[PDB]
Every structure is written in structure tokens, then in C-alpha cells.
Amino acid sequence: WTATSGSCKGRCFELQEVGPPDCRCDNLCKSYSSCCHDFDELCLKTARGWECTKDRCGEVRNEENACHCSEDCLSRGDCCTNYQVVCKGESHWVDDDCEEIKVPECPAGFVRPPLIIFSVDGFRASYMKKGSKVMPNIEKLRSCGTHAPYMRPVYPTKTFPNLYTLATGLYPESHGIVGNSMYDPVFDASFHLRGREKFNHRWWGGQPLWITATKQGVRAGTFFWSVSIPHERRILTILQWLSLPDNERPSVYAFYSEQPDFSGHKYGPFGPEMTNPLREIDKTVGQLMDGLKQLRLHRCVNVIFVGDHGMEDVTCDRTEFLSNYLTNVDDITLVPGTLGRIRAKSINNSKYDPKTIIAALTCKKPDQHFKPYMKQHLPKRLHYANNRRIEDIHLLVDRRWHVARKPLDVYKKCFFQGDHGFDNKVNSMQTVFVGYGPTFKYRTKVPPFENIELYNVMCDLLGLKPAPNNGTHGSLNHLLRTNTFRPTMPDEVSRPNYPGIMYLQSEFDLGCTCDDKVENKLEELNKRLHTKGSTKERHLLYGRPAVLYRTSYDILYHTDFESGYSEIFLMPLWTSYTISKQAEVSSIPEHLTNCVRPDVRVSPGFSQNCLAYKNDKQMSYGFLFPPYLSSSPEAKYDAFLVTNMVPMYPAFKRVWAYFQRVLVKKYASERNGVNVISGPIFDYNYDGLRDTEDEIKQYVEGSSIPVPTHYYSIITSCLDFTQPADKCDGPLSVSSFILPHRPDNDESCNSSEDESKWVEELMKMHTARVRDIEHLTGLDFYRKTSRSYSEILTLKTYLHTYESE
Ligand SMILES: *[C@@H]1O[C@H](CO)[C@@H](O[C@@H]2O[C@H](CO)[C@@H](O[C@@H]3O[C@H](CO[C@H]4O[C@H](CO)[C@@H](O)[C@H](O[C@H]5O[C@H](CO)[C@@H](O)[C@H](O)[C@@H]5O[C@H]5O[C@H](CO)[C@@H](O)[C@H](O)[C@@H]5O)[C@@H]4O)[C@@H](O)[C@H](O[C@H]4O[C@H](CO)[C@@H](O)[C@H](O)[C@@H]4O[C@H]4O[C@H](CO)[C@@H](O)[C@H](O)[C@@H]4O)[C@@H]3O)[C@H](O)[C@H]2NC(C)=O)[C@H](O)[C@H]1NC(C)=O
Ligand SMILES: Cc1cc(OCc2ccncn2)c(C(C)(C)C)cc1Cl
Ligand SMILES: [Ca+2]
Ligand SMILES: [Ca+2]
Ligand SMILES: [Cl-]
Numbered sequence: 091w092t093a094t095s096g097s098c099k100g101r102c103f104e105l106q107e108v109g110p111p112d113c114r115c116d117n118l119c120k121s122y123s124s125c126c127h128d129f130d131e132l133c134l135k136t137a138r139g140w141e142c143t144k145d146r147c148g149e150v151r152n153e154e155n156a157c158h159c160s161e162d163c164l165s166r167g168d169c170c171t172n173y174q175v176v177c178k179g180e181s182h183w184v185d186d187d188c189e190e191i192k193v194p195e196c197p198a199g200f201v202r203p204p205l206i207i208f209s210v211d212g213f214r215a216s217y218m219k220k221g222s223k224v225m226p227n228i229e230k231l232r233s234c235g236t237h238a239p240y241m242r243p244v245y246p247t248k249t250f251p252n253l254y255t256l257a258t259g260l261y262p263e264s265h266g267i268v269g270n271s272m273y274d275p276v277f278d279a280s281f282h283l284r285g286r287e288k289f290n291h292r293w294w295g296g297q298p299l300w301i302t303a304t305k306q307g308v309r310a311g312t313f314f315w316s317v318s319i320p321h322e323r324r325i326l327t328i329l330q331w332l333s334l335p336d337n338e339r340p341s342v343y344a345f346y347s348e349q350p351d352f353s354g355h356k357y358g359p360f361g362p363e364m365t366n367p368l369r370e371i372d373k374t375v376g377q378l379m380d381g382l383k384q385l386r387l388h389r390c391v392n393v394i395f396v397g398d399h400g401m402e403d404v405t406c407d408r409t410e411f412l413s414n415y416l417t418n419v420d421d422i423t424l425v426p427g428t429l430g431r432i433r434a435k436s437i438n439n440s441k442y443d444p445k446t447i448i449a450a451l452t453c454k455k456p457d458q459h460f461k462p463y464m465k466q467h468l469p470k471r472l473h474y475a476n477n478r479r480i481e482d483i484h485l486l487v488d489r490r491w492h493v494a495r496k497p498l499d500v501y502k503k504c505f506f507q508g509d510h511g512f513d514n515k516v517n518s519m520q521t522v523f524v525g526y527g528p529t530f531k532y533r534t535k536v537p538p539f540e541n542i543e544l545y546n547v548m549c550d551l552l553g554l555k556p557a558p559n560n561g562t563h564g565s566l567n568h569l570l571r572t573n574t575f576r577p578t579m580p581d582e583v584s585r586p587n588y589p590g591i592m593y594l595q596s597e598f599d600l601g602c603t604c605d606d607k608v609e610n611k612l613e614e615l616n617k618r619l620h621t622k623g624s625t626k627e628r629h630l631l632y633g634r635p636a637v638l639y640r641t642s643y644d645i646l647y648h649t650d651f652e653s654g655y656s657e658i659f660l661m662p663l664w665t666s667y668t669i670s671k672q673a674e675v676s677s678i679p680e681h682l683t684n685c686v687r688p689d690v691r692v693s694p695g696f697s698q699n700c701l702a703y704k705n706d707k708q709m710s711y712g713f714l715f716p717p718y719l720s721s722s723p724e725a726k727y728d729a730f731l732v733t734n735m736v737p738m739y740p741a742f743k744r745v746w747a748y749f750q751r752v753l754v755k756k757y758a759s760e761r762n763g764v765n766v767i768s769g770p771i772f773d774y775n776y777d778g779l780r781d782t783e784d785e786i787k788q789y790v791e792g793s794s795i796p797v798p799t800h801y802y803s804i805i806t807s808c809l810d811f812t813q814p815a816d817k818c819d820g821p822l823s824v825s826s827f828i829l830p831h832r833p834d835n836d837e838s839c840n841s842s843e844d845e846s847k848w849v850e851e852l853m854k855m856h857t858a859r860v861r862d863i864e865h866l867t868g869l870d871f872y873r874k875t876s877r878s879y880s881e882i883l884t885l886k887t888y889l890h891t892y893e894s895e
């Protein structure tokens with residue numbers, strides 16, 4: 091109940107929400123059915139429209155008008171945005187040359203430059219180039235300020251997950267808004283785009299920017315705009331708040347536009363009908379900038395022009411139907427569209443089985459346009475698993491397609507020609523970023539980055555300390571003229587041991603054998619030096635990774651590779667090696683096929699054993715430094731050490747062997763040498779974070795050898811590929827992956843074929859940031875380079891996407 095018979099007199103778009111059943115006058119009252127009786131009349135004026143004309147100049151103030159052209163309007167803060175232009179001979183902001191804003195030029199009483207976030211729904215990255223002719227204000231912001239060619243949204247590439255990620259710096263799995271539709275089994279409650287439940291605060295986790303600001307003494311304008319409030323009024327309201335007295339005036343504001351998304355759904359991303367919505371958005375930007383210029387704020391305010399996701403061509407005929415795969419279609423609930431989420435229709439039905447649902451959806455048709463996953467097997471770069479609102483069964487839908495349960499769902503619901511929601515690496519889903527103002531750089535292009543990074547920057551822009559989030563603070567310092575955040579490297583927590591030769595061969599009873607008894611002062615001093623770390627500067631190019639948790643581990647040096655060997659997990663945490671352009675690939679000699687050698691630097695009690703692999707009929711083993719890339723027949727023996735061995739399903743060895751035998755050398759050829767760091771990852775609770783030992787759910791049968799859920803590699807070279815990886819003077823280039831360690835290759839539908847037809851495609855799908863691997867391992871890489879730390883942070887957030895231009 092609301093007693094809607096109070097009044098909005100003097101209260102229009104009040105910043106503090108009043109408690110029911112007192113009537114509300116805030117920009118949210120419309121959404122709650124709670125506005126005072128006179129809200130429309132007082133707060134949503136429209137008389138005479140939105141622009142001054144010649145005949146209105148210096149008019150007598152009429153309080154009925156939408157905006158004003160009277161002499162007193164500047165001091166009242168309520169002129170039409172074009173008042174100075176029409177009535178005072180001023181130029182529009184877009185017609186002024188751009189001039190570097192070296193320092194904030196703010197009216198007296200402003201303690202800090204305000205921030206205005208101008209967010210646009212469905213604004214695909216390529217609109218910046220393709221619509222440039224019809225967006226002169228946006229193009230001026232873009233060319234004069236700081237911009238990226240595109241900004242990567244989060245998955246799923248839907249509106250609320252992305253806007254709330256912008257507000258919090260969190261992955262959807264952590265902020266809780268994991269889709270546009272949700273069921274929370276703990277609450278036993280559902281969240282929908284339509285309706286009231288979406289306004290309940292228990293859906294919205296983390297700490298959004300307006301709360302961060304308020305808690306730290308910075309006032310905030312409202313972020314949510316009720317749909318029926320026209321754009322012109324949103325702008326005028328922001329401008330009015332900006333004329334408040336110093337103690338009442340917010341420092342952070344948001345505008346939101348439902349366009350171009352709204353039209354994009356109806357006409358497709360490049361429909362001829364799309365030109366008009368882009369013109370209209372640009373005109374709105376023009377109104378804001380003219381309005382700031384009138385208030386002498388146009389060289390004071392930082393403006394961020396940012397999208398939530400792009401838009402792809404998607405029509406009704408490109409719909410796959412679960413009814414063409416499943417007999418039990420009525421025993422399942424599907425969240426449909428550009429992604430699929432499946433759960434049982436009834437928790438009372440114990441005959442429901444996810445295993446057989448997945449199998450029935452796996453590689454069943456030759457051109458199948460979706461791929462089923464258990465959520466923990468989704469590419470780790472999506473960070474889409476650790477939330478009870480994300481169903482165990484997930485369908486990754488191909489770009490341009492939909493998934494639906496039954497045909498009737500689609501024609502009893504062609505309407506649409508566009509949609510979004512797909513994998514956040516897809517080009518059509520990419521969106522925009524422009525920063526313009528005293529705190530941003532002048533005429534600067536920056537590399538593409540992920541929207542999870544912006545919360546930290548918005549906090550820096552406002553002098554706020556960010557709540558804990560998934561950004562990497564400092565990685566976007568290169569966007570900023572000032573207010574940078576000067577992070578330090580995390581402290582190493584565990585220092586390594588450097589074991590020498592401490593064990594005789596006969597002390598080991600591991601059930602391993604090797605044909606290696608084949609017997610020189612020249613080359614005995616030589617081998618000693620290699621074991622003491624003489625080639626270490628060649629194979630460990632950026633310093634050893636720091637171990638950021640408490641553990642027991644040994645550094646092991648070898649001619650061709652260096653490793654950090656965990657006495658707790660019985661295998662390396664990391665193995666580092668450099669492969670120059672000239673390096674030669676060789677084979678595993680016949681007499682060494684099953685060779686595994688005790689490492690006399692490491693106790694039997696802290697070693698793996700061969701008997702466990704023999705006894706474990708599902709589990710085989712592989713090596714982290716590949717024997718194929720040994721520098722000499724003699725160095726090859728090092729690669730067969732029990733300390734270089736890791737557990738691998740035979741199905742996974744097909745992947746790994748092709749990566750090590752073919753792909754590493756290909757990359758070294760193309761990139762002029764690579765440095766490779768590889769290792770295991772344990773993430774049994776799919777939280778994106780390193781497992782402790784007591785979280786490991788699987789061991790090699792009969793042993794304490796833990797089975798990794800994934801294997802990583804980080805592959806680094808010189809960005810200037812005229813320089814070899816091991817002699818690089820400037821910026822680095824990186825690509826990484828986190829491959830799932832799976833006992834089958836069901837994910838790859840062409841796996842019966844030669845590895846050359848499917849392996850590299852799988853690795854591309856599981857591309858990762860170095861930062862993703864840092865979370866998963868508790869390691870910190872690139873500790874010793876000649877580069878600035880902020881530059882290294884940017885490198886650690888890089889994602890190699892393998893999309894075209
Ligand atoms: C991305 O960035 C984010 C932010 O930094 C990272 O997420 C953090 O990770 C931490 C580790 O997982 C986690 O710390 C835990 O916090 C527990 C208290 O949490 C509450 O309070 C915070 C602070 O205000 C709040 O933010 C939390 O909000 C979550 O939950 C509510 C609903 O409950 C949601 O609305 C909200 O969206 C959010 O949900 C998300 O997080 C939870 C986990 O907290 C997930 O379950 C959800 O799926 C969702 O993703 C909370 O309200 C604290 O209790 C934990 O402490 C336990 O574990 C420690 C280990 O040190 C142990 O020492 C303690 O004893 C304790 O164990 C006891 O409880 C166990 C579990 O019940 C039990 O088994 C034991 O036996 C003990 O009894 C823990 O410290 C932190 O909360 C989240 N923060 C957020 C915002 O998500 C994230 O990791 C980053 N991602 C990547 C890839 O890097
Ligand atoms: C810039 C911005 C705008 C936002 O909301 C704008 C909006 C969206 C849908 N309907 C009405 N208004 C949000 C919400 C989290 C969604 C509050 C966050 C940000 Cl960062
Ligand atoms: Ca949207
Ligand atoms: Ca984990
Ligand atoms: Cl969804």
C-alpha cells in the first residue's frame with residue numbers, strides 16, 4: 091500500500107528514497123506504483139518541448155514548461171540545453187575544436203571532477219566506425235578523449251549481468267545476476283525482467299559503485315531510470331542535480347539508454363532502421379555536452395560512454411529444438427535463447443538424470459549449433475559456474491542461433507532479427523568504451539579490455555577505495571592522465587628449497603624402470619653446472635613465479651627447463667622452458683618409451699610412483715617439459731625424471747602430445763622463440779581459485795597423487811618479433827590456455843580425426859588470461875622484467891581471442 095495523496099511539490103527526483111506508505115517522487119517511484127498523485131504534473135513536464143527557439147529568448151518564466159529560455163534559467167539550473175546557442179550566440183559543443191584538458195576547470199566549490207556514466211544498451215563496438223557519419227558528438231568524444239577499439243562484456247552477454255558487472259567489478263557468478271532470468275533454490279524464488287521480484291535486494295550481491303561512494307562520503311545520483319521517463323528529462327534532471335549546492339550535489343551520475351538495443355532486436359544490428367536510433371543517441375549526447383558547457387562543466391566532468399553488449403543477427407528459423415534430441419522433453423525446464431540452462435522440472439523426480447541428458451545432446455547432428463556442458467567444464471575464461479543460480483547443465487549456443495525446448499515455444503511466445511547473450515569472445519557481442527575529461531588522456535587509443543576492470547577506474551576517478559572485486563587494479567592506469575593507482579607486487583609467502591643430490595638410486599622403490607645405465611671430465615663439470623642453474627637465465631626469462639600461499643616446494647634446475655616442484659602435491663606447480671626459433675623437434679627413442687627415472691634430489695616419500703599408474707586402469711601420465719624438445723640426446727634423460735611426470739587420462743594425452751610435439755615448435759617459428767610455463771590446476775569446487783589439498787576429489791588409484799582438473803600453459807615472446815624471445819628489449823606478447831583435464835574428448839565432435847583437425851580448435855576455445863591462471867594456482871608471474879608494473883598488469887589481463895578483425 092502507498093498513500094499516494096502526499097505531494098511532489100519541491101521534491102521532483104529527490105535523491106533519498108522515503109519509506110512507504112509515504113508517497114515517492116524519486117526516479118524509481120514509477121516502477122513501484124508509488125509516485126505521489128502529482129508526479130506527472132510537477133516532475134514530468136513536457137510543455138513546449140525540449141529546445142529553445144528564437145521567440146522564447148528571454149521569455150517570462152512559465153513554470154509549466156519542460157525547460158526554460160528565460161533570463162533567470164542559468165541560476166535556476168533549468169534552461170533547455172540549447173539556450174545559450176539559440177539565445178546567447180554560443181556554439182554547440184560539437185562545433186568547438188577540441189582542446190586538451192590538462193587540469194580540471196571547475197566552478198568554485200567543486201571538491202573533485204564529477205563522473206557521468208553514459209550507458210547505452212546494445213551498442214555494438216563496430217557502430218563507432220560504421221555509424222561515425224551520423225554520430226558527430228560521440229565521434230568527438232571518441233577522437234578527443236581516450237578510447238578502446240572495443241570493450242569485452244562478461245558472459246552471458248545480457249543487459250543486467252553486464253550493467254551490474256559495470257557497477258561492481260564482479261563476475262556474474264559472484265554478483266549473483268547470472269542471467270536475465272533466474273531461479274534461486276535456497277530462496278525458492280524466481281527473477282524475471284518483467285515484474286517486481288527483480289527489485290528485491292537479495293538478488294544483488296557485491297557492492298555497487300553508488301554504495302561504495304555513499305559509504306565513503308561521496309553522493310550519488312540514481313542509476314536506474316524508469317522506462318517511461320524520456321531521455322531529455324533524464325539529461326535535464328542530471329543537469330539540475332549538478333546545480334545543487336555543494337553539500338547536496340552528487341559527484342557520480344548515470345544516464346541509461348534502451349537504444350540501440352530495442353531497435354536492434356527488431357531490425358538486426360545493421361538494419362536500415364538502425365540509423366535513426368544512432369542519430370537519436372548522438373543528439374542526447376549533444377544535449378548533455380551543451381548543457382555541461384552552459385554550466386561551465388564541460389572541462390570539469392569526466393564522461394564515460396560505455397555499452398553493456400553488442401548485437402548479432404538471429405532469426406526464428408535459426409532455432410535448434412531440444413525436442414529433436416530428447417525423448418523426455420517434458421521432464422526438463424529450459425532457460426532458452428542465446429544460451430541454454432537445463433534443470434529437472436520436478437525435484438521429486440528421482441528418475442531425472444543429467445548424464446543421459448548431456449549424452450543425448452552431444453554431437454548428435456552434423457551441424458549442431460549448440461554444445462552441452464556440465465557448468466564446471468565450460469571454458470574457465472567465462473567464470474560461469476560458482477553460483478547456485480547457474481544450472482549444472484549449460485548449452486553454449488553458436489552465434490546467430492537460438493535454442494528452445496519445443497517448436498511451439500517459438501511461434502506461441504518471425505518477430506526478431508537481432509539478439510545477444512552469446513560467448514563474450516564473439517565479435518558481434520563486443521561493445522564500446524570512451525573516456526573524456528580532465529582525468530582521462532588526450533587523443534589516446536588503448537588496447538581492448540574487459541568491463542570487469544572499470545569499477546576500479548571509476549573508484550580512482552572519484553578518490554574511492556574499491557570494494558574487493560575481479561578487476562586487477564592498476565591494469566587500466568594507461569587510460570588515465572592522473573589519479574593512477576600504484577600497486578605493489580604481492581609478497582612471496584613460501585620460499586623455495588634448492589635440493590642437491592641427497593638420495594641413492596636404490597632408496598627408491600617406485601616400480602619405475604629406465605634403460606639409462608649407458609655410461610668424462612669435460613662433460614661432468616658441464617652437467618653439474620646445468621643442475622646448479624647455469625642455463626637458468628635462458629629458460630626462466632621473467633624471474634621465478636612467486637608462491638603466494640604457505641607450502642613446501644623445491645626449485646629443480648636442468649639443462650633445458652627449470653621447475654618449482656611441490657612436495658605436497660608430488661608434481662611441479664610450474665615448469666619453465668624456452669624454445670628458440672631454431673630449435674629442433676626429435677622423437678622419444680624406442681629404448682626410452684616407458685622410461686621414468688628417480689630424481690636423487692627429491693626423497694622417495696615426496697615422489698610419484700609408476701606402480702600407481704600401472705594399477706590405475708583409467709589413468710596414464712605425461713610430462714610437463716616435453717621430451718620431444720630436448721636440446722641433446724643426453725639432456726633428454728632429464729625429461730624422464732619422476733619429478734617432471736604428471737597424471738593424464740589417455741584421451742587428454744592425445745591433446746597434450748600434439749601441443750608439445752607440433753604446436754610449441756610452430757609457435758616458436760611464428761613468434762621468433764617462445765618461453766613456455768606449464769603446470770597443473772586443481773579446481774574441484776569450480777570457484778576459479780586454487781584448491782587446498784583437502785579439496786581434491788580424485789587421486790591416482792591407491793596413491794596420494796592428486797589428479798588435476800586442468801593443465802595450463804603461458805606462452806610468452808617479444809612483442810617486436812624481430813627480436814628473439816630470449817633477447818627482448820621491450821614489451822612482451824602473451825597467449826595462454828587452461829585445458830580441461832578430461833577422460834574423454836566428447837567436447838570435440840571431430841576427435842576421431844587426426845589431432846591436426848581438432849586440437850588447436852580446442853585450445854583456442856580454452857584460451858585464458860595469465861590472471862585466470864594466477865587465481866587458479868596462487869602463483870604470481872612476470873616478477874622480474876624490465877617493464878613497468880602497470881604494463882605487466884595489463885599483459886596479465888590480456889586475452890588472446892582468435893576472432894577475426
Ligand atoms: C571475484 O571477486 C570476489 C570478491 O573479492 C571474490 O569473491 C570472494 O571470495 C571469497 C572466497 O570464496 C569469499 O570469502 C568468503 O566469504 C564468506 C562471507 O561472505 C559473505 O560476506 C561477504 C562480504 O560482505 C559477501 O560479499 C558475501 O556475498 C555472497 O553471498 C551472498 C548470499 O549469501 C550473495 O548475495 C553474493 O552475491 C555473494 O555470493 C557469492 O559468493 C559466495 C561465497 O561467499 C558463493 O557461495 C556464491 O556462489 C557467490 O559466488 C557473503 O554474504 C565467509 O564466510 C567465507 O569464510 C569461510 O571459508 C574460510 C576460508 O578462509 C574459512 O576460514 C572460514 O572458516 C569460513 O568457513 C566456514 O564456512 C564454510 C562455508 O559455509 C564451511 O564449510 C566451514 O566449515 C566454516 O564453517 C569466505 O571468506 C567472498 O565472500 C567472495 N565475495 C563475493 C562478493 O563474492 C571471488 O573469489 C573473485 N573471483 C575470482 C575468480 O578471482
Ligand atoms: C550505468 C548503469 C545503469 C544501470 O541501470 C540503468 C537501467 C537499466 C535498465 N532499466 C533502467 N535503468 C545499472 C543497474 C545495475 C541496472 C542499476 C548499472 C549501471 Cl553501471
Ligand atoms: Ca542490454
Ligand atoms: Ca577451487
Ligand atoms: Cl538468461
Ligand code: NA
Pocket residue numbers: 703704705706707708709710
Ligand atoms: Na594406467
Ligand code: NA
Pocket residue numbers: 835836837838839840841842
Ligand atoms: Na569427440
Ligand SMILES: [Zn+2]
Pocket residue numbers: 212249351352355510
Ligand atoms: Zn537486448
